[model samples]
Target chain A: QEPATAEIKPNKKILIELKVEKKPMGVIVCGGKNNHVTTGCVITHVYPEGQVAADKRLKIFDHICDINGTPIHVGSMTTLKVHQLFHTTYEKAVTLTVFRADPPELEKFNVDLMKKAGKELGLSLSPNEIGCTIADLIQGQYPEIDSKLQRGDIITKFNGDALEGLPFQVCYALFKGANGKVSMEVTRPKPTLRTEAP
Target chain B: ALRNGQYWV
Candidate 1:
């Protein structure tokens, strides 16, 4: 008898933008039982008149992959951390990288962002072993990049050059010294699932 | 925070 090969399918990815602050952001997310590690947070409900509902893009049952460029994926997921992110007083629009049961499949995408003089990109990046990793985003900062980059995203390339093996200081210099619009190639991770051989 | 008896966030 021959063994059967199994195929697996993963969830879809989508990005939604919302303003997070001290007040209610109008979205309720739940995940994990207390403090124990589990899958990422899921959006159980959205307030009708709140900021999340105003955009009409997010839907119930959507799994939040990350907020404001942070990775809240499996094992690293907990509602307490999410609560701190939401309730902590801050004024800025953040991007929500979501995982949906169904959506067009996408992996790498390029984003271009611009900032005014004396203004910051409103985002921070940490140098990874091979790429530039987005660390955090500041509130009330550049909505340009804020709408595009999310936490946990690994920037494989900046402008046209790859950032692989570059030091943090060099990457920072390249990002901070940019003149016009900046281009970035983002590699966002997709969910993983395993299936048994039938 | 933890409204409606849901889990963490």
Candidate 2:
């Protein structure tokens, strides 16, 4: 694919602003189920036959940057999961921003995320090779967790443990290794380029 | 690439 969010785009970042004219958009969303990983209400699909069409303004893998004028960040807020937000708030020609491509800037934070081995701690991991990509986060699950990390946020280090081109399984072990109290280096898309290796 | 889905009105 052409990269769903601007955070993954190394050479491009395009914000697809859309206004779909439909009562209830037939869309699907995916959120995390636990506290180990969490994310924003990410749109998974806009069915073709229904109101929200895949080719018209939205696509399968577009990030819902905002609704109307509200910036929906995964780091904060817990109003809707994904499709539920659309099911309830969707109206005539709803306004939203879709993002794609752009190299996310790197950051570091000591987060306290805990999860057990062979179990889902509210998120999933994939070897983007850039780092361990935080694919999702479960909403309303870890009320104790106040993490600013969101979907597409890549984790280059866990508890000061740098990923440095580690394999998927090994990297995941390091992530799962540190529980409840750990600092990590992550990345997200930014408009300006980074001068240092931040 | 990103496999994340897009949303619309």
Against the hidden reference, what TM-scores do the models get? 0.45, 0.39
Q: Candidate 2: which stretches are off by over 4 Å?
A: A1-108, A113-120, A140-147, A192-198, B1-9
lDDT of 1: 0.56
Model 2 C-alpha lDDT per residue in residues A77-196, reported as the tens digit of each score: 443443346667444555555554333222354455544343334555544445665545655444432356555455666777776567767766675555455556665433222111
Best candidate, lDDT-wise? 1
Superposed model 1: Cα runs more than 4 Å off: A1-106, A193-198, B1-9
Output the worst ten-in-a-row residue range by lDDT, candidate 1 chain A.
A1-10
CAPRI rating of model 1: incorrect
lDDT of 1 by residue, A1-198 (tens): 111111112364555566554346665454433521244565544556666666566655456766775766545545466656655555766676666656522258788867566566655665544366554455566565656655445678988879876876787777777767778887654433211111
* Fold similarity of candidate 1's chain A to the true chain A, as a TM-score: 0.46
How well does candidate 1 reproduce the true complex, by DockQ?
0.03
In model 1, pairs of residues that clash are A69-A150, A69-A151, A70-A151, A79-B9, A92-A140
